[PDB]
Design a protein around this nucleic acid. Structure first.
Lengths: 146, 46, 108, 67, 297, 119, 102
RNA sequence: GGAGUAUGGUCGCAAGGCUGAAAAAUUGACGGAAGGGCACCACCAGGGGUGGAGCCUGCGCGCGCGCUACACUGACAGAGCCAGCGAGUACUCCCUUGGCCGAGAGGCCCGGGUAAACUCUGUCGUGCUGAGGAAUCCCUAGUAAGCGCAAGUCAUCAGCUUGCGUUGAUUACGUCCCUGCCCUUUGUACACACCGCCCGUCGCUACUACCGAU
């Protein structure tokens, strides 16, 4: 997916589906964004045709990647060639041989290729205290900042 | 309906699972340690 | 054990970078960075909570001696635009009385 | 639901509280406010009630009667 | 006054932590008495615990009354149980709709010494301080989604629990026309709890049970035509409240009158309504691994 | 303790002593004869004298300020004044302690928090 | 009126619940219904089996009340959803069936 | 080796079909008439929805719960004046024509689609430029309505939900006469005081005698 707007614990998600029909198949389900946040797809969202509402642990950031772990069943094929080597027989070629044969690249995705990253040394904001609390709180712990 | 059925299936499966394996582990430990302590008493006799 | 593992067996994996259709929106918070953001948020919210216990269990008639020797926070009511509930102090300088000021002036 | 409702009202037994008598402790028996060796153990308990009245007065009138 | 409630709050917490320590000790204490009773050997450490023996000879008998079920354990509740007819009020969220205010009306009529209030534009901690200023014993905020109820907050004063619980599968009175339904029979009903077996289960049972006037203990079985029934499967507290008529001693005829709730309770905060400095006594834990499957209650 | 454990009047005296002390202010529990046995304390009575309870309730800072303060009389207790710094304070009264009708200690408080209103 | 009072009255009109009658009274009754009437009774007096608008009709047309059963709808929908979706989930990947033309 | 504490294996019993789905009771059963208390599921006074048009969640084309339109309650222009919730290295309305620099993956640049309210002053003068029936349901002091600004609390809620501040009224605030509901006619502490054995149909228990078969 991709997050659209991020309130504290719940969150909208943008570019994952097209239709709230598909989401209403996907009700109540499980959604595990990269960082480590298990969470629940609750309910389709109305006006943008494709957006939907989840609830997660803490806010996913705006820079996240919301995923949905699906397991899709598959079916091998049914082709079969006996090798009639005492008669002569056609082999289906190798795929490297195929791309060598008719000059078509071995595909890749630059998003997919591993890279190293250059993170910054992550620091933080200072604590903030609301001014309500700042004017209420008892003496011996009253903040002093000139 | 998918939700209530699938998750009921998970529950029944896990119960049968841990039951089956605690059965096999207990039987196997009992037999192997049984004859093991027997070998212990036998070698300790000499 | 620890020699029951092959070399390519211990060859472990390498993180997946931010996709380059996106990178103008920030680095990709994988697991460790999430843990860091968590623990910071956690110790800050527990500090906030303990302060809330104190501010709901103040007593209005405390008495100290600081209250004889500091300003008070007060409120917007008496302080103005410029009020957080900080209790100020000095910055360091005081009313420096006249005779020494004359001395300063002569030197300058 | 309906049958268990039926079941409990049939063999009517209720988990709900009853009105306890308001001062069960000093008045466990509860006669109306109206017209009407073990001996060594008894002597001991009488002496205990003695010491109790003593300490009662001493404590409460030590703390100026807010109790 | 607010002083003395707050000081009693923190006092009650202090006695609770003391109860934790002394309970861990008394686990070693209880092992002695029955061992004296049966003459069977014990662990020689617990035997050679000196302070245990001295304090034992001083304090057997409270454990004896515990075994007897005589005594009333410390909690939020068991101070004044069968004395005060517990006053209960109800008020919804900030701006109620019609069906919501009717259902709050109905649930005022379901709990029998309930008074209803309408909330208007009025501030949540001042509602709490005002109920505390009238010496209540309950408060119940009930929220709405779109002309249907959502979430009941069975909070119990002076400093006990707030069970905030979503409701599901609710349908009201005021859909069924006034000819078919009748005006409610306001009597002090009975209360029947079906299936609660964990200590958390009986904790929730306690905070429900003290929302009801103390039935007079003489002929509790026979009198009273009104019963209320809480029952749980898959943690789901579900209530049906029935006025019965009893045509025989082999057949009783019910009449569904009070509404239909099935509430799932998602928090018991051991701290009263607004107090966001909460002691989370339990919650519905989604989102963990096997907390979907396994069962509290 | 000497009494046999099955005695109803013994349990009644147990609950008696523990309730009266727990509402007195010495003790901490309401369950343990052991706690009566070696918890009850002349320092606990000392801890319930009215100097130290205004210290813990955070009127003054320490028991010097508290005790001198009470000598010159600034602490009402509900309605009365206080002269005699051993007015024992039960748990019920440890809320209604407060400062007197108009004293300069009250005005220290209010001059600091800027609610000083001479009326 | 109350649900209690109306139902007591109705079951008295049926006569199921009243005072203890006499032998000659039972003789008179044998000298001179109840099942389907009690069906109607339980139907009327457990009315949160179903859902009803409190208004009546917005317009009264004359040309010659239950508008639904939620419990029955949940029941039958459960039956259909079982008999199709469960057997699909159990034969997710099952190849081979009987084709029968007749 | 002793003591417990478990885990599952082993054995005995429970594990033999006069069968074939649909009371107890001296206290028990149901009523009625007098006497009080109560109630916005009652009267009396008033208000305000929904129900008209449309949008639309939810519940079973129907339905209510919300939201929006509807003209003097006018517009437009200036001037003047006050709030509460509010702070996680955190929040973005899309998707696209061109061009830039990028042997390629992109980034740029340009286009296309710290309230509401109130008060004051003037400029105009009703103009497809019409405030929801029967029905029903709610409501008595910061209660009703109107207004906004915020937060988005695991559960439910963005088609919204929840907070909190602002402006703040009429009309009752009596009464058990309607409809009711509860409970008195037992028991439950004694004074000076007052009252003065409700009623029904039966049941059940003891006794009396009867009737007639065998």
């Amino acid at each position: 997916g991709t997050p659209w707007k991020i309130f504290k614990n719940t969150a909208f998600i943008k570019d994952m589906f097209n239709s709230s029909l598909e989401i209403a198949k996907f009700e109540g389900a499980a959604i595990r964004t990269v960082s480590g946040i298990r969470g629940q797809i609750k309910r389709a969202l109305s006006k943008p045709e494709g957006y939907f509402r989840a609830t997660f642990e803490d806010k996913i950031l705006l820079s996240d990647i919301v995923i949905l772990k699906a397991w899709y069943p598959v079916k091998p094929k049914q082709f079969y060639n006996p090798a009639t080597n005492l008669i002569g027989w056609q082999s289906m070629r190798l795929t490297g041989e195929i791309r060598r044969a008719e000059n078509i690249p071995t595909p890749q995705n630059p998003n997919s290729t591993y890279r190293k990253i250059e993170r910054p040394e992550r620091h933080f904001n200072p604590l903030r205290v609301p001014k309500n609390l700042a004017a209420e709180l008892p003496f011996k712990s009253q903040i002093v900042q000139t | 309906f998918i939700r209530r059925e699938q998750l009921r299936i998970k529950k029944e499966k896990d119960e049968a699972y841990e039951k089956k394996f605690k059965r096999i582990i207990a039987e196997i430990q009992n037999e192997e340690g049984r004859a093991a302590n027997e070998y212990a008493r036998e070698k300790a006799a000499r | 054990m620890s020699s029951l593992r092959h070399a390519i067996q211990r060859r472990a994996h390498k993180e997946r970078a931010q996709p380059l259709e996106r990178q103008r929106l920030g680095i990709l918070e994988k697991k460790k960075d999430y843990r860091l953001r968590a623990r910071d948020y956690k110790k800050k919210q527990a500090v906030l909570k303990s302060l809330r216990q104190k501010a709901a269990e103040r007593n209005e008639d405390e008495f100290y001696f600081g209250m004889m020797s500091r300003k008070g926070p007060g409120s917007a009511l008496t302080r103005g635009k410029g009020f957080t509930g900080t209790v100020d102090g000095d910055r360091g300088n005081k009313a420096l009385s006249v005779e020494t000021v004359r001395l300063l002036k002569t030197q300058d | 639901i309906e049958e268990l409702i039926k079941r409990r009202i049939l063999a009517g037994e209720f988990d709900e509280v009853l009105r306890r008598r308001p001062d069960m402790f000093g008045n466990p028996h509860g006669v109306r406010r109206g017209l009407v060796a073990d001996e060594k153990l008894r002597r001991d308990e009488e002496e205990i009630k003695r010491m109790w009245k003593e300490i009662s007065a001493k404590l409460d009138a030590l703390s100026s009667w807010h109790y | 006054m607010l002083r003395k409630q707050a000081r009693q709050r923190r006092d009650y917490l202090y006695r609770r932590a003391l109860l934790l320590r002394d309970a861990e000790i008394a686990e070693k204490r209880a092992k002695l008495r029955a061992a004296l009773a049966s003459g069977k050997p014990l662990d020689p450490k617990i035997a050679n615990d000196k302070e245990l023996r001295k304090d034992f000879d001083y304090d057997v008998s409270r454990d004896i009354a515990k075994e007897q079920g005589e005594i009333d354990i410390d909690d939020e509740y068991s101070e004044l149980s069968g004395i005060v007819d517990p006053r209960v009020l109800v008020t919804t969220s900030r701006d109620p709709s019609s069906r919501l205010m009717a259902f709050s009306k109905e649930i005022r009529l379901m709990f029998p010494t309930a008074i209803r209030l309408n909330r208007g534009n009025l501030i949540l901690p001042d509602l709490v301080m005002s109920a505390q200023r009238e010496r209540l014993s309950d408060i119940i905020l009930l929220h709405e989604h779109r002309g249907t109820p959502t979430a009941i907050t069975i909070s119990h004063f002076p400093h006990g629990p707030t069970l905030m619980a979503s409701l599901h599968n609710v349908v009201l009175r005021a859909d069924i026309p006034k000819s078919i339904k009748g005006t409610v029979s306001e009597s002090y009903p009975h209360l029947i709890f079906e299936g609660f077996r964990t200590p958390l289960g009986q904790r929730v049972v306690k905070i429900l049970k003290h929302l009801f006037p103390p039935r007079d203990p003489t002929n509790n079985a026979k009198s009273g035509n009104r019963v209320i029934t809480f029952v749980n499967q898959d943690d789901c507290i579900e209530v049906r409240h029935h006025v019965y008529v009893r045509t025989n001693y082999n057949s009783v005829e019910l009449s569904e009158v009070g509404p239909r709730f099935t509430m799932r309770p998602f928090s018991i905060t051991m701290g009263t309504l607004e107090n966001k400095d909460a002691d989370v006594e339990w919650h519905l834990s989604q989102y963990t691994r096997t907390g979907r499957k396994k069962n509290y209650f | 303790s000497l009494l046999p454990p099955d005695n109803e009047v013994r349990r009644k005296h147990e609950t008696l002593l523990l309730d009266k002390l727990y509402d007195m202010g010495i003790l901490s529990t309401k369950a343990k004869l052991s706690a009566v046995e070696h918890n009850v304390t002349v320092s606990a009575f000392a801890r319930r004298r009215l100097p130290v309870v205004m210290t813990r309730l955070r009127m003054a800072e320490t028991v010097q300020a508290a005790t001198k303060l009470i000598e010159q009389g600034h602490v009402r207790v509900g309605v009365e004044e206080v002269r005699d710094p051993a007015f024992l304070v039960t748990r019920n009264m440890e809320d209604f302690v407060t400062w007197t009708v108009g004293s300069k200690i009250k005005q220290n408080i209010m001059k600091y928090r800027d609610k000083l209103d001479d009326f | 009126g109350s649900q209690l009072k109306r139902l007591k009255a109705s079951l008295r009109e049926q006569g199921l619940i009243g005072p203890q009658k006499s032998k000659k009274q039972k003789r008179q009754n044998a000298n001179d219904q109840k099942a389907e009437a009690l069906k109607s009774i339980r139907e009327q007096f457990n009315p949160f089996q179903f859902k009803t608008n409190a208004r009546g009709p917005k317009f009264e047309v004359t040309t010659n009340v239950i508008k639904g059963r939620p419990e029955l709808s949940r029941a039958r929908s459960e039956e259909k959803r079982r008999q199709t979706i469960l057997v699909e989930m159990q034969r997710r990947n099952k190849v081979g069936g009987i084709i029968d033309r007749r």
